[PDB]
Amino acid sequence: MITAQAVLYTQHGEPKDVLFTQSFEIDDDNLAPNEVIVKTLGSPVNPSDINQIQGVYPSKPAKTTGFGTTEPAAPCGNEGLFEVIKVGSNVSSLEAGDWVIPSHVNFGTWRTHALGNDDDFIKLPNPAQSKANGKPNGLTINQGATISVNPLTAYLMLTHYVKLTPGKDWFIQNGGTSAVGKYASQIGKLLNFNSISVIRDRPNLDEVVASLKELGATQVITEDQNNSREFGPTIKEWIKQSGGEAKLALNCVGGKSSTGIARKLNNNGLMLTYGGMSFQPVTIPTSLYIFKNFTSAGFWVTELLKNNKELKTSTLNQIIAWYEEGKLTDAKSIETLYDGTKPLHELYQDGVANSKDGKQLITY
Amino acid sequence: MITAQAVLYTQHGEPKDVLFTQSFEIDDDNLAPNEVIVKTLGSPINPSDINQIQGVYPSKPAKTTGFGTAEPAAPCGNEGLFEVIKVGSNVSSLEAGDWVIPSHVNFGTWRTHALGNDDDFIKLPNPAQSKANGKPNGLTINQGATISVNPLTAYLMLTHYVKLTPGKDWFIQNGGTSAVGKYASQIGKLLNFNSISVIRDRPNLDEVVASLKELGATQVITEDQNNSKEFGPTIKEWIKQSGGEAKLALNCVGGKSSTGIARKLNNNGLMLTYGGMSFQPVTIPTSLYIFKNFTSAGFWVTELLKNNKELKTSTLNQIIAWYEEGKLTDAKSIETLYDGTKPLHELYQDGVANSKDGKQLITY
Ligand SMILES: *O([C]1[C]([O])[C]([C]OP([O])(=O)OP(=O)([O-])O[C][C]2O[C]([N+]3=[C][C]=[C]C(C([N])=O)=[C]3)[C]([O])[C]2[O])O[C]1N1[C]=NC2=C1N=[C]N=C2[N])P([O])([O])=O
Ligand SMILES: NC(=O)c1ccc[n+]([C@@H]2O[C@H](COP(=O)([O-])OP(=O)(O)OC[C@H]3O[C@@H](n4cnc5c(N)ncnc54)[C@H](OP(=O)(O)O)[C@@H]3O)[C@@H](O)[C@H]2O)c1
DSSP states (O other): OEEEEEEEESSOSOHHHHOEEEEEEEOOSSOOTTEEEEEEEEEEEOHHHHHHHHTOSSOOOOOBSTTSOSSOBEEOOSOOEEEEEEEOTTOOSOOTTOEEEESSSOOOOSBSEEEEEGGGEEEEOOHHHHHHTTOSOOOOHHHHHTSSSHHHHHHHHHHSSSOOOTTTOEEEESOTTSHHHHHHHHHHHHTTOEEEEEEOOOTTHHHHHHHHHHHTOSEEEEHHHHHOTTTHHHHHHHHHHHTOOEEEEEESSOHHHHHHHHHTSOTTOEEEEOOOSSSOOBOOOHHHHHHHOOEEEEOOHHHHTTTOHHHHHHHHHHHHHHHHHTOOOOOOOEEEEOOSSSOHHHHHHHHHHTGGGOOEEEEO | OEEEEEEEESSOSOHHHHOEEEEEEEOTTOOOTTEEEEEEEEEEEOHHHHHHHHTOOSOOOOOBSTTSOSSOBEEOOSOOEEEEEEEOTTOOSOOTTOEEEESSSOOOOSBSEEEEEGGGEEEEOOHHHHHHTTOSOOOOHHHHHTSTTHHHHHHHHHHSSSOOOTTTOEEEESOTTSHHHHHHHHHHHHHTOEEEEEEOOOTTHHHHHHHHHHHTOSEEEEHHHHHOTTTHHHHHHHHHHHTOOEEEEEESSOHHHHHHHHHTSOTTOEEEEOOOGGGOOBOOOHHHHHHSOOEEEEOOHHHHTTTOHHHHHHHHHHHHHHHHHTOOOOOOOEEEEOOSSSOHHHHHHHHHHTGGGSOEEEEO
């Protein structure tokens, strides 16, 4: 028998208040024929995971007593990389040593182990398999553990809604230092799209601007520049020189930031709102709608891919291939290793509290 | 001392999610004068038990800490057969070895043992007692465990409301393959009432028709036939040939099915609704109320027998006698035995999930 740990809550609220660790038992002897046991290698903290715990995210796992609690409790985390440790006698899709992610949301990835079927998982090539299949690179644990939400989100927003002419057209995005922002910049570079990333000013501004330009942002501006009527004509010059148009805006901030990036689009522009990193609503001047034919819409990768498994597979395959080819790198995570001395839920609580420092990955 | 197990929940929800098993101690060396300890022999899973756990049934046991839980918890199950194992110094009505059912609802029968007062139980004859009293049969465990709700429901609906003339009048009922339905057909035969059972179509329709007819249904029709304008005159022919009238409809379905059985009654008809599938409301054409003196009412055995021990006693005694005489038969339960190797709540969760296979009885 394996003794596992899961991060659970019995009631919605802030992670600092409601999370605890539950020890539970998994039977790793005498597997059913289709069953698969996996050990976690790592799982990140994404905003969606936190919103799920807070109760403001309408897709969530059921509260159950299945982890051996008396009160119904929900697990946490939708994304993660797991190593297959044992498979049942009718399992050929997976074997010991294989890398997998969950095939569906609401799996509960903030935990040490899981028992499911082979259809609960999607296989990723492990480094040994990538090299054997003649690839110059294999995935890292961070790359595998964060492959499923943010890279697909960036890829689909940039490709699935409006067609940007390679070598000419632009997108503009706020939250430029976000993991999603960093994938968008790289995917923009790979597809030959011009882009403007908007970021908050900070003391190490120059270092950040350089990182983002290296990733693929054509220009990086601050939110102060975004707000600036004086600066607008400079952006117009860039776009005019390119021969192209700013056709797409990606908004994960809301408020004034959403106003600023919308104003920078050419007529007939599209904005996709995929997040709201301050509680501020999407705010658009009436004149953009009426006089510039602006359109504002939403994006939600979970809903988009629900009955679109071909689209999911195709997108994921492209990200894997790019990683194997050395053409894509990961939005880097701050890693915290679980080793048994500090309760698992506290690692995640610290991760939630240190969100501002950057993407957090709990490792195992 | 006795280490017992109870199936409990701290919060309402689906049985698959909220049930757990709680160990608790009964001190069998510390009985008060009027107290009795019983060992469960068997308890079924009925829809009302499930609705209770889900939180949509307005009669339910209180949540308490009495089973030694940290948080308040409620037990499950309303019906069951128990064996008296020990009685207090002032108990005369029961002795060790006796068979009993709960005297009242909300007792919590999904558990191994209970401590209660002598008046929390009603004695049934055990097989040794039936045999000693000159009876050709004694009750089976399934018969005793399911005697409290369904048989009594059928008998009272048939006899307590409208007086059917033996050898000529008719009742019509839907849910004809239900436990209640099957008891009603038998009681109809025993009292010489004609009846029409309405059932859903199924692959072995003809085989089921024949079984229901053997039980006592005069005629059996599908829901399609119940709906059918074409078929309706055939039913009128049956009733006219008998010299009697259709005076009573028993409804456990609602919706179109309820409309159809109501339309088949003669003037001055009474419908009793005792259940309802798919949340479909009871739907009765206005014309029947106005022009055919139709009445529609409810039946709930829990409420009818709440303050009427004498009617309960007389009815229960008739059912017992019929079992002893070999005049009534139960539908075959699927029995799952608790031996202490699989948690008790999981046996009941399986039974809930497997409801469609047949009535589920957990035995001990
Ligand atoms: O500015 C902040 C960061 O740029 C950014 C957050 O970065 P992150 O890496 O921690 O978060 P990500 O995992 O990339 O994603 C966060 C947002 O995107 C939404 N999202 C992601 C994927 C899929 C969906 C979807 N709909 O399919 C949605 C998610 O809900 C998040 O909203 O935020 C910036 N930030 C923080 N506070 C800000 C702010 N910008 C402006 N104003 C305020 N108050 P930094 O680098 O710290 O300065
Ligand atoms: N008010 C009361 O005093 C009281 C007391 C006892 C029972 N009841 C009611 O009676 C019913 C269950 O009694 P039971 O223990 O006899 O149950 P049961 O043995 O499990 O039988 C259930 C019946 O419901 C039928 N059914 C299921 N879904 C249906 C649907 N969608 N449309 C039409 N019929 C459907 C089944 O038909 P199939 O065989 O085709 O699947 C079967 O005949 C419940 O509605 C319950 O609330 C009420």
